[PDB]
A paper describes a structure:
To gain mechanistic insight into the MORC4 activation process, we crystallized ATPaseCW (aa 29–486 of human MORC4) in complex with the non-hydrolyzable ATP analog, adenylyl-imidodiphosphate (AMPPNP), collected and analyzed X-ray crystallographic data, and refined the structure to 2.9 Å resolution. The structure reveals a symmetric parallel homodimer with each ATPaseCW protomer coordinating one molecule of AMPPNP and one Mg2+ ion. The ATPase module folds into the GHKL-type domain, consisting of a mixture of α-helices and β-strands, and is involved in the formation of a large dimer interface, which was also observed in the respective structures of MORC3 and MORC214,15,17. Two zinc-binding CW domains tightly pack against the ATPase domains and are positioned on the sides of the ATPase domains opposite to the dimer interface and are far apart (colored yellow in Fig. 1d). Each CW domain interacts mainly with the loops between α8 and β10 of the ATPase domain. The residues P279, K289, and K297 of the ATPase domain form a number of polar and electrostatic contacts with the Q424, W426, Q428, D430, W435, and A449 residues of the CW domain. In addition, the hydrophobic side chain of M294 is caged between the aromatic rings of W426 and W435 of CW, and the side chain of R69 of the ATPase domain is restrained by hydrogen bonds with the backbone carbonyl groups of D430 and E431 and the carboxyl group of E431 of CW. Strikingly, while the MORC4 ATPaseCW cassette structure superimposes well with the structure of ATPaseCW in the homologous protein MORC315 (RMSD of 1.5 Å) and shares high sequence similarity with MORC3, the mechanisms of action of the two proteins differ. The ATPaseCW cassette of MORC4 is capable of binding to DNA and therefore is active, whereas the ATPaseCW cassette of MORC3 represents an autoinhibited state, which does not inherently bind DNA. Furthermore, the R225/K227/K314 cluster is formed by R225 and K227 from one protomer and K314 from another protomer in the dimeric structure of ATPaseCW, suggesting that dimerization might be important for the association with DNA.
Author numbering: 29 to 109, 116 to 171, 175 to 179, 183 to 246, 260 to 326, 329 to 351, 358 to 404, 420 to 442, ...
The structure:
């Protein structure tokens, strides 16, 4: 009837500017593997060399997607959503922020579907609109025929057997695998992300917290209570409950002016030197190590989850409202009170079971073990007992 609002392929480049830091795009991808619909048990971040080209790999063993839902994924604004995703843009901004081209393999226990979000493909054919090739799969193919030809002719996978074997890189029968190539290179010529300095870490070519340049430490605190396992370059990331790993822990509260829900704030001391305020939102870290009050008070960390706020388009900050300024003022005042109240090893030690993903409180020390199971506890010794009261 009426002509639709088209979208230029340049928009894929434009949208990539949503994230000012690449760890935020990577966080977008991890947030998509952890949301309750998918609820992946494990995600794998790695760098793989394909066709003499560096590729970022994000492989989760989650629910998987249908060919229809994969198109919805590669489309804008489509989301069936305390999940983290709200916009229906996270992947389209994050993957493009990481590289020019992205492939998404997904299997949901019966269908093998491939999707391509590549600006290189769109610029080679000089398309005027955004074209997204998608192919579903016995492994017999199922509309998808020109998509498969475009993928074989313009992506990094030229042979059909290699394209299908990429599904075997999912550690289960259901899961998703994102593969981003043509990564962002900064002005000095090198790649923005560092793969060679630390074989078990992805760094940034940079006082400044180690979370700002170390992807391992960033993933360690990306979530307020981790439930999903993260493997950075085949090595498990020892995540932590940033609130429970503090010493001399005291508590405070904050009431938003537009509701009657008390929000708990946890104040403590860091055990390894760096510090500030951890502002979360639906378990996701939005603002990290924000100095408030007498910190501009060394070593004190305050944890707060602000579900009464709403993050920005990139989930790196919040909307600048009266509630936000009031929350920061309150945090500064209460942190000053906490530090005034005081004039090592954490008060509690918590470990996540490797097979079980629950957090158990141990009477021990804190770094933390790589693999640990409920069966190894000192009494809660079985993986069938739920978490503690917390
Ligand atoms: N790794 C994944 N595994 C399974 N399903 C996924 C995955 N990534 C995306 N999806 C699905 O595809 C949709 C695309 O989401 P996306 O465009 O990234 O934004 P969103 O997750 O909907 N919310 P937002 O991140 O704020 O934009 C998701 O809502 C899921 O339904
Ligand atoms: Mg998303
Ligand atoms: Zn367990």
């Amino acid at each position: 009837g009426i002509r639709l609002s088209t979208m230029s392929p340049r928009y894929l480049q434009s949208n990539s500017s949503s994230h000012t830091r690449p760890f935020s795009a990577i966080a977008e991808l991890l947030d998509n593997a952890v949301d309750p619909d998918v609820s992946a048990r494990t995600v794998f971040i790695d760098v793989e060399e394909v066709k003499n080209k560096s590729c970022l790999t994000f492989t989760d063993d989650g629910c998987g997607m249908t060919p229809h839902k994969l198109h919805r994924m590669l489309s804008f604004g489509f989301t069936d959503k305390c999940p983290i995703g709200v916009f229906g843009n996270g992947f389209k901004s994050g993957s493009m922020r990481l590289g020019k081209d992205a492939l998404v393999f997904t299997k949901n226990g019966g269908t093998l579907t491939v999707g391509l979000l590549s600006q290189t493909y769109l610029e080679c054919v000089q398309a005027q609109a955004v074209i997204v090739p998608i192919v579903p799969f016995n492994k017999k193919m199922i509309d998808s025929l020109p998509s498969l030809e475009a993928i074989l002719n313009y992506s990094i996978f030229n042979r059909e057997n290699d394209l299908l074997a990429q599904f075997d890189a999912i550690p289960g029968k259901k899961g998703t695998r994102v593969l981003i190539w043509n990564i962002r290179r900064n002005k000095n010529g090198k790649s923005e992300l560092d793969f060679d300095t630390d074989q078990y870490d992805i760094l940034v070519s940079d006082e400044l917290p180690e979370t700002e340049y170390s992807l391992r430490a960033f993933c360690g605190i990306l979530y307020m209570k981790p439930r999903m396992k993260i493997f950075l370059r085949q090595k498990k990331v020892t995540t932590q409950m940033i609130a429970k790993s503090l010493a001399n822990v005291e508590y405070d509260t904050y009431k938003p002016t537009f509701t009657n829900k008390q929000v708990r704030i946890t104040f403590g001391f860091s055990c390894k030197n760096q510090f500030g305020i951890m502002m979360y939102h639906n378990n996701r870290l939005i603002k990290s190590f924000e100095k408030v009050g007498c910190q501009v008070g060394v070593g004190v960390i305050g944890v707060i989850e602000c579900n009464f706020l709403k993050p920005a388009y990139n989930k790196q900050d919040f909307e600048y409202t009266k509630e936000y300024r009031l929350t920061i003022n309150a945090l500064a005042q209460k942190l000053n009170a906490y530090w005034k109240e005081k004039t090592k090893v954490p008060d509690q030690t918590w470990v996540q079971c490797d097979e079980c993903l629950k957090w158990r409180k141990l009477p021990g020390k804190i770094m933390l073990p790589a693999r640990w199971f409920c069966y190894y506890n000192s009494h809660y010794r079985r993986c069938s007992v739920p978490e503690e009261q917390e």
